[PDB]
């Protein structure tokens, strides 16, 4: 349901997926430790550096 | 050059002036915490149509969007914020006497220090906005809608690692150069061997990569401007510092073995002019990028052009008489 | 967890030099029953990931198992060459997914399991080029080199990154091609073999890699231009495509063409007996890949010879049709 963003011609599916994941980590605040801990543990086990917004 | 004049009634020092895209409107901002909009009549006059408070600090710039996004203004401040403003027909409420029909749709707050410059992007990218600040960062924001100008996603933080004084977007609508931004620095340290840095949006890494840094600009920078592109295979860049400078930046064609990295430039200085005998405090180009203007502590706006041999010279001096 | 414990233990017993006095027996080597059990579980793992896409991904994407990094780490340890062979086959079955293969190519280049970067002080090679010439060539058995050829044989079907080795060396595949050509193929006939069949089991898995590399290469005008790359502050020429290198070695009087044609001679000579012999099915495939290489050269020769004429590159090459009429050095006739 990402239907509320006009298609700016310098993006791709990679960072709209990062944008959706950011939106979910801001939409579901009631348990937000577990969902940041989960995402960061999944990134670090794959060796992926963490975004400014996630930190 | 033929002059008309206007009493501007800002109640402290004015810091900036900017035209609309048609030259039918102009904006100005002050240490009195105000912005004003002035509009050019169907009789050749100019009238002040809005005059309102924008911020809590001194206002350090004012800038317009391109009119395919309507009538939108941005302003940056010493209170560490920037603000976005829309002109609205018919909203203006006598329930709150003396407010403007230029309404603040948002405030950006994420800079740790004074926001020194603000510039809207080349319209082909989207409704995008850049700001810079004395935390040594440039920040780039995107509106996902053109009507809901309250909502702006911060997409990039760009690390200069020196204080930021000014910024310039590259005016290339040509889909053979990737998106670019140049940044100037007010840093007075002798440790930072370069005061201008240049960044490229690299599709292969989706962040603003630092392509180049001008190792001949050892001295503090107050303003910076790319020249509008008449089809040129190379960019031109004006800088305001202890002197005026004009650089060329000509893209080095990648071999089919240098993937993933940014571009690189064959860079020259084409001109450097001391002739202000003083510091340079703005650099702005005519619509075709063929004439530069620059101001200094000599109380002169000086005009500069190429001759038919691309030898750049001074062509005019616009100066006060004090009568 | 068992593989991570073995990696942690074997990597801790590395000899710090200054300790020249009376050690006891180091009671920390994998026992034969643990080796046979690890082989059986690697063989189970390899069958599962050979068939299920979802099982390759959902093992490689695991935060705590990191199986590629643990297995490549164990290949750097002093473990038996049979256990290294089943580890390499497990990587070859993982390397069927192109996402895994692209990360595995970078991980192989970083781990130097083949030494692609040779340091000017270094009097002895490291990795599989020593294990082949000092371990397999003392056992008369070649399980590690065959499992490495099988790993490269899968990792070509998903393609290889054009930037492979960039910033460490000139980019491209040729260090792996030099090993497979000059240390495996050109030496498969001068080695001794405890299994008379294994001489042909080695020939199949190298000619398969060359066949894939020549099947999927198409000549481009770029191949005939020397592309320069900055390396540590010097401008160095990039490695040409492995298919360009294979075409150049088949369009000249090369030891690779001598070995190919003297495989076709030996193939007919064994077949004209009509007898059963050890490894017959592997000689028949090694002849099949050898014919299919020459056939792919003849199908691509004219285009390669025209792009060479347009580019003005100072190389000489002869039509394979003419080289096939060359005097066979064994029989002293034009009998190829």
UniProtKB/Swiss-Prot annotation, chain A:
It comes from the Eukaryota. Signal peptide: none annotated. It is found in: Nucleus, Nuclear pore complex. Part of the nuclear pore complex (NPC). Forms part of the NUP160 subcomplex in the nuclear pore which is composed of NUP160, NUP133, NUP107 and NUP96. This complex plays a role in RNA export and in tethering NUP98 and NUP153 to the nucleus. Functions as a component of the nuclear pore complex (NPC). Involved in poly(A)+ RNA transport. It is linked to Nephrotic syndrome 19: A form of nephrotic syndrome, a renal disease clinically characterized by severe proteinuria, resulting in complications such as hypoalbuminemia, hyperlipidemia and edema. Kidney biopsies show non-specific histologic changes such as focal segmental glomerulosclerosis and diffuse mesangial proliferation. Some affected individuals have an inherited steroid-resistant form that progresses to end-stage renal failure. NPHS19 is an autosomal recessive, steroid-resistant form with onset in the first or second decade of life, resulting in chronic kidney disease. This is Nuclear pore complex protein Nup160. It comes from Homo sapiens (Human). The gene is NUP160. The chain holds residues 1272 to 1326 of 1436 of the full protein.
Swiss-Prot record, chain B:
Transmembrane segments: none annotated. Keywords: Cell cycle, Cell division, Centromere, Chromosome, Chromosome partition, Isopeptide bond, Kinetochore, Lysosome, Membrane, Mitosis, mRNA transport, Nuclear pore complex, Nucleus, Phosphoprotein, Protein transport, Repeat, Translocation, Transport, Ubl conjugation, WD repeat. InterPro entries: G-protein_beta_WD-40_rep (IPR020472), Sec13/Seh1_fam (IPR037363), WD40/YVTN_repeat-like_dom_sf (IPR015943), WD40_repeat_dom_sf (IPR036322), WD40_rpt (IPR001680). GO terms for cellular component: cytosol; GATOR2 complex; kinetochore; lysosomal membrane; nuclear envelope; nuclear pore; nuclear pore outer ring; Seh1-associated complex. It holds the Pfam family WD40. GO terms for molecular function: structural molecule activity. It is found in: Chromosome, Centromere, Kinetochore; Nucleus, Nuclear pore complex; Lysosome membrane. It comes from the Eukaryota. Its main location: nucleus. GO terms for biological process: attachment of mitotic spindle microtubules to kinetochore; cell division; cellular response to amino acid starvation; cellular response to nutrient levels; defense response to Gram-positive bacterium; mitotic metaphase chromosome alignment; mRNA transport; negative regulation of TORC1 signaling. There is a cross-link at residue 11 (Glycyl lysine isopeptide (Lys-Gly) (interchain with G-Cter in SUMO2)). The GATOR2 complex is negatively regulated by the upstream amino acid sensors CASTOR1 and SESN2, which sequester the GATOR2 complex in absence of amino acids. In the presence of abundant amino acids, GATOR2 is released from CASTOR1 and SESN2 and activated. PROSITE patterns: WD_REPEATS_2, WD_REPEATS_REGION. PANTHER family: NUCLEAR PORE COMPLEX PROTEIN SEC13 / SEH1 FAMILY MEMBER, NUCLEOPORIN SEH1. Belongs to the WD repeat SEC13 family. This is Nucleoporin SEH1.
Swiss-Prot record, chain C:
The modification Phosphoserine is found at residue 16. Expressed in the testis. It is found in: Nucleus membrane; Nucleus, Nuclear pore complex. Transmembrane segments: none annotated. Belongs to the NUP186/NUP192/NUP205 family. Plays a role in the nuclear pore complex (NPC) assembly and/or maintenance. May anchor NUP62 and other nucleoporins, but not NUP153 and TPR, to the NPC. In association with TMEM209, may be involved in nuclear transport of various nuclear proteins in addition to MYC. Part of the nuclear pore complex (NPC). Forms a complex with NUP35, NUP93, NUP155 and lamin B. Does not interact with TPR. Interacts with TMEM209 and MYC. It is linked to Nephrotic syndrome 13: A form of nephrotic syndrome, a renal disease clinically characterized by severe proteinuria, resulting in complications such as hypoalbuminemia, hyperlipidemia and edema. Kidney biopsies show non-specific histologic changes such as focal segmental glomerulosclerosis and diffuse mesangial proliferation. Some affected individuals have an inherited steroid-resistant form and progress to end-stage renal failure. This is Nuclear pore complex protein Nup205. The lineage of its organism: Eukaryota, Metazoa, Chordata, Craniata, Vertebrata. The chain holds residues 560 to 895 of 2012 of the full protein.
